[PDB]
Design a binder for this molecule. Structure first.
Ligand SMILES: *[C@@H]1O[C@H](CO[C@@H]2OC[C@@H](O)[C@@H](O)[C@@H]2O)[C@@H](O[C@@H]2O[C@H](CO)[C@@H](O)[C@H](O)[C@H]2NC(C)=O)[C@H](O)[C@H]1NC(C)=O
Ligand SMILES: *[C@@H]1O[C@H](CO)[C@@H](O)[C@H](O)[C@H]1NC(C)=O
Lengths: 364, 5, 5
């Protein structure tokens, strides 16, 4: 039993279930998402909520953040992901920005630090633009300039009292990069039947590969692309038959299925043709979270934030995630696998089982 | 995630 | 790959 891994699996399972809701909502749009990111934010939300509100979050996540033994398990998980032995870079930081004159429950600040290894930041939301800049700047710094305008105008106002954020940054280099010379434009077939010409990378190598079947009989390829540090990998999956929609896969997705893919892999020679892409999406998490049973936190008269403060009633006004990803050749006879149709991708830290990023590429 | 009064 | 959330 390895506690950091146990927590990583629960967090990933929850995060993938949230993605599933998002995918089903926007079935034909590009979606880049962070399962670990949403789990981190909801974990902090557990500490600030109480009563039935906290109970709904805990039921959905499958664990309680304040159980005896969670602090070191979480502390160690952070270290497992960010350790130099990974070679590939991962940086994750949690932060809480709270209205300065808001009276906090005693022992909250120490408790928050113990679990999230970050100190509570106090701002004045009455000076709207100032507070918005402070938060946006913090995020920009912690995502190395990639996410520069997290909170748009109107996202926060004078009635805002609390902002919870997780900044996640990943920089990896392929174990075997794609030859720059092999890249050229090829046709990608969109779900609506249209066709676009996009730059596609190509590489022949012995890849860890496996083929699964959906419960209704459609086979799909899963291929693993490891990063140079050997602890992180990107899995790409897509139906074999071009007539089968990607939704057939997103509907059966789970953290366990992803583990099963990795466990069933065999190193086989394959020619891989994969589109290079640069995606940025902002997803509203309100409906996906309500669908998983977290309804109270969004309601002015039902939400319970007494674990944070008794002073005044609070409620979640907005819950969203902004993610950005760029995939290219290099960073910082074999059967053919051509991703010239919508496909799924998953970035995973294999030792812990942490699903950091995932998404559906509907149009490169 | 933003929480307001 | 470069990614941020
Ligand atoms: C390999 O994957 C198994 C699930 O996928 C099936 O086998 C590979 C493909 O043919 C795919 O289409 C199939 O759906 C997974 O199997 C599970 O094994 C456990 C016992 O270890 C059973 O309790 C469970 O019922 C079973 N699931 C299914 C759906 O049969 C294997 O665990 C996995 N192997 C590894 C090493 O991860
Ligand atoms: C294949 O997977 C095994 C783990 O099952 C790993 O040791 C190996 O590095 C992988 N090979 C590649 C080329 O990804």
């Amino acid at each position: 039993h390895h506690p950091p891994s146990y927590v990583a699996h629960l967090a990933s399972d929850f995060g993938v279930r949230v993605f599933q809701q998002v995918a089903q909502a926007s079935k034909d749009r590009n979606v880049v998402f962070s399962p670990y990111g949403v789990a981190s934010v909801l974990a902090m939300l557990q500490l600030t909520t109480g009563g039935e509100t906290q109970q709904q979050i805990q039921a959905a996540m499958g664990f309680k953040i304040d159980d005896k033994g969670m602090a070191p398990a979480l502390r160690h998980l952070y270290k497992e992901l960010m350790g130099p032995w990974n070679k590939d870079e991962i940086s994750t930081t949690d932060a809480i920005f709270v209205q300065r004159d808001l009276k906090l429950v005693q022992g909250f600040m120490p408790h928050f630090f113990r679990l999230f290894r970050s100190t509570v930041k106090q701002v004045d939301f009455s000076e709207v633009e100032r507070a918005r800049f402070i938060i946006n700047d913090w995020v920009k710094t912690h995502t190395k300039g990639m996410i520069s305008n997290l909170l748009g105008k109107g996202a926060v106002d004078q009635l805002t009292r609390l902002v919870l954020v997780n900044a996640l940054y990943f920089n990896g280099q392929w174990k075997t990069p794609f030859p720059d010379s092999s890249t050229h434009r090829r046709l990608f077939h969109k779900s609506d039947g249209s066709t676009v010409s996009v730059p596609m990378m190509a590489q022949t190598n012995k890849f860890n590969y496996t083929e699964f079947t959906t419960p209704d009989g459609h086979y799909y390829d899963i291929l693993e692309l490891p990063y140079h540090g050997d602890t992180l990998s990107m899995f790409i999956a897509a139906p074999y038959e071009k007539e089968v929609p990607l939704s057939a896969l997103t509907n059966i997705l789970s953290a366990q299925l992803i583990s099963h893919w990795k466990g069933n892999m065999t190193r086989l020679p394959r020619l891989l043709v994969l589109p290079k892409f640069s995606l940025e999406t902002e997803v509203d998490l309100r409906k996906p979270l309500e669908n998983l049973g977290m309804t109270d936190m969004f309601r002015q008269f039902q939400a319970d934030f007494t674990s944070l403060s008794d002073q005044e009633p609070l409620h979640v006004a907005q819950a969203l995630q902004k993610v950005k990803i760029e995939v290219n050749e290099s960073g910082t006879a074999p059967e053919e696998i051509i991703m010239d149709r919508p496909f799924l991708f998953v970035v995973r830290h294999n030792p812990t089982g942490t699903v950091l990023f995932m998404g559906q590429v509907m149009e490169p | 995630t933003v929480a307001s009064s």
